[PDB]
Amino acid sequence: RPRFSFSIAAREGKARTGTIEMKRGVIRTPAFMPVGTAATVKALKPETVRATGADIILGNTYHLMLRPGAERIAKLGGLHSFMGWDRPILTDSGGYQVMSLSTKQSEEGVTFKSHMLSPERSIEIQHLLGSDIVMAFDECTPYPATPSRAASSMERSMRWAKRSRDAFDSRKEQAENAALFGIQQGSVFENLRQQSADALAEIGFDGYAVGGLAVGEGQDEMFRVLDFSVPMLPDDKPHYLMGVGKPDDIVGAVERGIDMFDCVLPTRSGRNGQAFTWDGPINIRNARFSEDLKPLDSECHCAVCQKWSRAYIHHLIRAGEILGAMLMTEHNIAFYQQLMQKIRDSISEGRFSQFAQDFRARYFA
Amino acid sequence: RPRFSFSIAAREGKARTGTIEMKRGVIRTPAFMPVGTAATVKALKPETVRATGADIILGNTYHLMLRPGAERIAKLGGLHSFMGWDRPILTDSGGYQVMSLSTKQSEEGVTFKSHMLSPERSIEIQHLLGSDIVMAFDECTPYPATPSRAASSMERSMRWAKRSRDAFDSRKEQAENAALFGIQQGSVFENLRQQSADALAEIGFDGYAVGGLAVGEGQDEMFRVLDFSVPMLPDDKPHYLMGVGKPDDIVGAVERGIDMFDCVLPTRSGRNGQAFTWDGPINIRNARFSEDLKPLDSECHCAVCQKWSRAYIHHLIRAGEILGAMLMTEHNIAFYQQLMQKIRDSISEGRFSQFAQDFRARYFA
Ligand SMILES: Nc1nc(-c2ccccc2)nc(=O)[nH]1
Ligand SMILES: Nc1nc(-c2ccccc2)nc(=O)[nH]1
Ligand SMILES: [Zn+2]
Ligand SMILES: [Zn+2]
Numbered sequence: 026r027p028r029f030s031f032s033i034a035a036r037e038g039k040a041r042t043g044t045i046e047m048k049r050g051v052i053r054t055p056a057f058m059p060v061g062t063a064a065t066v067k068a069l070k071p072e073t074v075r076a077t078g079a080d081i082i083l084g085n086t087y088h089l090m091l092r093p094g095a096e097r098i099a100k101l102g103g104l105h106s107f108m109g110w111d112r113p114i115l116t117d118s119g120g121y122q123v124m125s126l127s128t129k130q131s132e133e134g135v136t137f138k139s140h141m142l143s144p145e146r147s148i149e150i151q152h153l154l155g156s157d158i159v160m161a162f163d164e165c166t167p168y169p170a171t172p173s174r175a176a177s178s179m180e181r182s183m184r185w186a187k188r189s190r191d192a193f194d195s196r197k198e199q200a201e202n203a204a205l206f207g208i209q210q211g212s213v214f215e216n217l218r219q220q221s222a223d224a225l226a227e228i229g230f231d232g233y234a235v236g237g238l239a240v241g242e243g244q245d246e247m248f249r250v251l252d253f254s255v256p257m258l259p260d261d262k263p264h265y266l267m268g269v270g271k272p273d274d275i276v277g278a279v280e281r282g283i284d285m286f287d288c289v290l291p292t293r294s295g296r297n298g299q300a301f302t303w304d305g306p307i308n309i310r311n312a313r314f315s316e317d318l319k320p321l322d323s324e325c326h327c328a329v330c331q332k333w334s335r336a337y338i339h340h341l342i343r344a345g346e347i348l349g350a351m352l353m354t355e356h357n358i359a360f361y362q363q364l365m366q367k368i369r370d371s372i373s374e375g376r377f378s379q380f381a382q383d384f385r386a387r388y389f390a
Numbered sequence: 391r392p393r394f395s396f397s398i399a400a401r402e403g404k405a406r407t408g409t410i411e412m413k414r415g416v417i418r419t420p421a422f423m424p425v426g427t428a429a430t431v432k433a434l435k436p437e438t439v440r441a442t443g444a445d446i447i448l449g450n451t452y453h454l455m456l457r458p459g460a461e462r463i464a465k466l467g468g469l470h471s472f473m474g475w476d477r478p479i480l481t482d483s484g485g486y487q488v489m490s491l492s493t494k495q496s497e498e499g500v501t502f503k504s505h506m507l508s509p510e511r512s513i514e515i516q517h518l519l520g521s522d523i524v525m526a527f528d529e530c531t532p533y534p535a536t537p538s539r540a541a542s543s544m545e546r547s548m549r550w551a552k553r554s555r556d557a558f559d560s561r562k563e564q565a566e567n568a569a570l571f572g573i574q575q576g577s578v579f580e581n582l583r584q585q586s587a588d589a590l591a592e593i594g595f596d597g598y599a600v601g602g603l604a605v606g607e608g609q610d611e612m613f614r615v616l617d618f619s620v621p622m623l624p625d626d627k628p629h630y631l632m633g634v635g636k637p638d639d640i641v642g643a644v645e646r647g648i649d650m651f652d653c654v655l656p657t658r659s660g661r662n663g664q665a666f667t668w669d670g671p672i673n674i675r676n677a678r679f680s681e682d683l684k685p686l687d688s689e690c691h692c693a694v695c696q697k698w699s700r701a702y703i704h705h706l707i708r709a710g711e712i713l714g715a716m717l718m719t720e721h722n723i724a725f726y727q728q729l730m731q732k733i734r735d736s737i738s739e740g741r742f743s744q745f746a747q748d749f750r751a752r753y754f755a
Contacts, residue, residue, distance in 0.1 A: 068712040093705045332474050340458045347433040
């Protein structure tokens, strides 16, 4: 099996659909990655995650290095064995969470409480976890930022990107079996995004993430930045938008050339009682669902919608029952995967523009 | 299919093993019933409950009448449809929980806050839920109690038992498709237990519960009372010990003629980090399991023990992850079902005495 082989099968405008072949499996793109923070996709067994259609999940380096610890997970046989997911795992670098969840920043890296993270240590931690797609250690520039502060931050991220590349390449077993993605920064500024893209391309990565855009800038601004940022990245490698997003965010980002996504929304909002449907999100705890015998979504193919009603799930979530969180989460992840499948098929079939319009019309109605 | 047919296939001492055939399925005895309080066996899909070997689950009349409500569940198609469990369900009468969870007691029944429960209303609620085994509405005498107070309480329960019988029999659809169990009371007093047994037998029930013994009297005292109480009940009907218990409680009660059990222990203690093993319970959060790659129990056949380590489950429970509760609960219910299976097979094979001794020796070691 290939270490990493990205093939584009079809295009429509800026949108692409295809596959990433890796040693632990094939990733169909555009892809959505369920987030598995503390070595679990919350409230789901791995077989259930797979049953929804997920090809790859995301693990969080920051969380796992603290609990249970990277060396410990390696001693226990790696993250795949540990959590019982045998397909690809992408690990974030810890660069974002080290700032949002903990700090002292310097050229060497970040020291923090509740430890030190550097490009080299991040790569080593991801090696110990046995990650399939390794993220370069970066800095998520706060939003908003002055052009000059965004520039100095992006430039540090680019130096860290080179250091991540070198650390990764130095570890033969990692270089042979895993892939490395670089992260574009530059805030909302076109010239900095270009400088960042050029720096990353000069180094060379297996894939390129658009970083710094899951920062509450709003969809309009996010799209504006994607409009010029994604074409700067190498066309022949995957484009990964970190931390995005709602279903309409995803459709628009794919329209702008994004191939990969991760977001806690389907899992987290699922536990909180929000279910995604083709007619938009619903709050299942709302009184209007108390005697509603329809499934969460009446076109959804997931196991939850085959078996249980809105009324039942309403009851569970209001009662604080774990099964409520389980069913909501499975449905939401399945919905996200069905969305990605519809996206992939429509691009392949050259009807993605129509799909996007049809989707938005119904979802917002 | 039979409404209710109890067959004893084999005996050893006071212990029996056999089957209860009902319209929604066969119940292998001795049986353990997972408790499904608010129309869910906590943290388990019904298919998972079934996969562990459970033939029947328990639903709680008190909880369900408040949330989502009995008439509502009936409107939604009954409890079986509502929660997606199509096999037998035994419903408790609400008689215990109305006192422990809420009161005004009278001959008519119990009025309470956070409503009124009577033998007739209890039976009607259980009818609306679509219960397969209906419990007579009773009074769980507090422990300890004077002989005279235990007597007046038991006598009220016996009058309520007759009223439950009459209400059940009046509802043709219920009488044709469900079964009715009476509940023996009398605290720890032999003469009152006898009076109670005689009263219940005079009325006639499909099964007989030993009530009033899940009250913190200790195992020695519980066994003492079972020693004389169970032989008072009709031999040819099932004997149900409500709210019991730990694995050794169950083995001893079967040695004393009990055929059916329910307990929240495997589910509740599972979520709290206690896993049952053949070498006794373990607290999975304990530091000694942090790098333990063995399954929860190395003889257990459950899906959890086929796939995940102690170390992983340790990590999940310490992290407050829902999957931790899911895996612990599935294992614990599976352990309980494997215990019942070993009990059934050993009685059938005429080696139950040896099994009980072997079990106790290892479990307490
Ligand atoms: N490492 C990194 N992570 C994220 C990020 C932000 C929000 C949700 C998820 C990831 N953004 C970045 O620019 N870098
Ligand atoms: N209805 C009833 N329930 C119980 C009971 C006690 C503890 C746990 C479960 C049931 N004991 C009784 O004597 N009657
Ligand atoms: Zn669904
Ligand atoms: Zn097990």
